[PDB]
Amino acid sequence: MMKKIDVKILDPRVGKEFPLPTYATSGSAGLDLRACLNDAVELAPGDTTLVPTGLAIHIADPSLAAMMLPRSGLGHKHGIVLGNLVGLINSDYQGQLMISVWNRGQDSFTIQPGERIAQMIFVPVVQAEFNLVEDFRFRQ
Amino acid sequence: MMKKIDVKILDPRVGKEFPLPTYATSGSAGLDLRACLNDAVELAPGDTTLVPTGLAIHIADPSLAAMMLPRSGLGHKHGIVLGNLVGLINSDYQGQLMISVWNRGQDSFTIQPGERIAQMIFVPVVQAEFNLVEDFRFRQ
Amino acid sequence: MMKKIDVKILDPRVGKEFPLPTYATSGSAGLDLRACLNDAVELAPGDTTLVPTGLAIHIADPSLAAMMLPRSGLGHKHGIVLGNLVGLINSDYQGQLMISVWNRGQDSFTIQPGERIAQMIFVPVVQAEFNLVEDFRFRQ
Numbered sequence A, B, C: 001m002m003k004k005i006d007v008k009i010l011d012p013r014v015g016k017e018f019p020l021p022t023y024a025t026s027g028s029a030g031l032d033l034r035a036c037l038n039d040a041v042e043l044a045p046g047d048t049t050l051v052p053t054g055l056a057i058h059i060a061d062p063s064l065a066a067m068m069l070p071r072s073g074l075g076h077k078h079g080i081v082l083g084n085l086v087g088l089i090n091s092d093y094q095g096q097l098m099i100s101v102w103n104r105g106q107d108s109f110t111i112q113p114g115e116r117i118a119q120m121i122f123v124p125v126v127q128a129e130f131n132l133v134e135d136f137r138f139r140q
C-alpha cells in the first residue's frame, strides 16, 4: 500500500552526500535512516547519543504513524539500538526526525556520518475512544 | 480511523486524581498511560518495577491489538523504558493493563503517582494461517 | 483479519518435537516462536545468542510485515528480551527466522529447546514515497 509523504530537507547534504532514505526492494517494510553528522561520534558501552537525520516528515493523515526500530544486524552483533527502544512518529509531528542511539553492549562503536543506523516503518493506527463500562483468561 | 473501546476503571482515582489516558492532538498516534500508585517508587539503575494503571480495556475485535512503548523523552534522557521492551495487548485480554518499567540507565529515577510513564498505540493485526510448502536476497 | 502465509520447515523437528507457532485464542495478536536447539543454551547476564526457529516464512504481500517482540513474562520477570529489541520481517524475506535473544538482567538464564521464547505479530505496512517540499507543536 503506497502513500506520498511530505518531506522537508533540513540539511543540504541530505539527498546528496547523505542519501535520502529508500526501500531496497519492492518488498521491504522499512526505510533505513542515515546519520546526519559532521564527524564520527564514538559511542561508549552503555551510552546514548542523539543523532540528527537532517530531515522532517509530515505524515499528516491521522490514520498513519511511523515506528523507528533498530536494524537487526547492528542490534544483534553490535548492540547498537535505540535509547527509547522504539520511536513513534505522530502524524502531526513536523520537527526534525531524531534518532536516540544507545549502545547496549560491551564494545565501543563509531557512528559514522551517512551510516544507515536505524529503520522506519509506516503502519496504520487507530484512535481509541474509551467507553466506560461496569463489566465487559504474567517459566513461561 | 476511530474505534470505541470498552474500559473498566479498577481504581477509583483513575478518571479523577489520575486522568484517563487521552490523545493530546487530533494527530497523535499514542495515548499516554499514567502510573496508578499510592506513593512514589524509586527505581534504581538496572532495576524493573511493575506499575499498575488502574484500568482494564477490552479491545474485543481480533483485527486490532495495542502496543505499549516507552515515551521518547523518558527513554532517551532518563533511560526509563519497558522491561519487556514493547508490550502487546491482545484483543481478548480483559485484565489490568500493567507497565513493566525498566531503568536501563545509570541514574536513579523516581516514578511518581499520576506520571505519564509510557504510551500505547492501537494497530490493526492480521492472524496468519500457515501453509506448508516444500519451496517458495545478518558494518551494515 | 486472516491471511494464509507460506512456511517452509527447515528442521524436521518443527511441527513434531518443536510445535509450529500457533495462536492460543481466537483473539490472540501474536504467535509464540520456539527455540530450535539441539541442547539448552545458558545465557549469562548481558549476553546475546542467536536462536534458530527451524522455519522460514514468505509473507509475499508488500502490504504486510511481521514484528518479533519479547514475551511480557520473560521480559519483565527474567530480563529475556531481543538483542535488536524488535525484529522486522520483510515481505520478501525467505530465509530462516532467527531470534536474537538478549539477557538484559542480572540472572543467568537457560534457553531450552522447544521453549516459547518470543512472539510475532503480522501488521499492515505502508510504503512511503517522499514528496520534497519547501514548507509543510524531547520531567515529561
Ligand SMILES: O=c1ccn([C@H]2C[C@H](O)[C@@H](COP(=O)(O)NP(=O)(O)OP(=O)(O)O)O2)c(=O)[nH]1
Pocket: A070, A071, A072, A073, A074, B138, B140, C068, C084, C086, C087, C088, C089, C090, C093, C096, C097, C098, C099, C100
Ligand atoms: O529479529 C529478526 C529481525 C530480522 N530478521 C530477518 C528478516 C528480515 O527481513 C531481515 C532483515 O532485517 P533488518 O533489515 O532489520 N536487518 P539488517 O538491515 O541488518 O539486514 P539487511 O542488510 O539484509 O537488510 O532479517 C530475523 O530473522 N529476525
Ligand SMILES: O=c1ccn([C@H]2C[C@H](O)[C@@H](COP(=O)(O)NP(=O)(O)OP(=O)(O)O)O2)c(=O)[nH]1
Pocket: A068, A084, A086, A087, A088, A089, A090, A093, A096, A097, A098, A099, A100, B070, B071, B072, B073, B074, C138, C140
Ligand atoms: O525516536 C523518536 C521518537 C519520537 N520522535 C519525535 C516524533 C514524535 O512525534 C515526537 C514525540 O514522541 P513521544 O510522544 O514518544 N515523546 P515525548 O512524549 O517525550 O514528547 P512529547 O511531550 O512532545 O509528546 O518526537 C523522534 O524524532 N524520534
Ligand SMILES: O=c1ccn([C@H]2C[C@H](O)[C@@H](COP(=O)(O)NP(=O)(O)OP(=O)(O)O)O2)c(=O)[nH]1
Pocket: A138, A140, B068, B084, B086, B087, B088, B089, B090, B093, B096, B097, B098, B099, B100, C070, C071, C072, C073, C074
Ligand atoms: O506490557 C504489557 C504486555 C502485556 N500485558 C498483558 C496484556 C497481554 O494480552 C498479556 C499477555 O502478553 P504476552 O503474551 O506478551 N505475555 P506472556 O506470553 O508472558 O503471558 P501469557 O502466557 O498469558 O500469554 O499481558 C500487559 O499488561 N502489559
Ligand SMILES: [Mg+2]
Pocket: A071, A072
Ligand atoms: Mg535492513
Ligand SMILES: [Mg+2]
Pocket: B071, B072
Ligand atoms: Mg509524547
Ligand SMILES: [Mg+2]
Pocket: C071, C072
Ligand atoms: Mg503470551
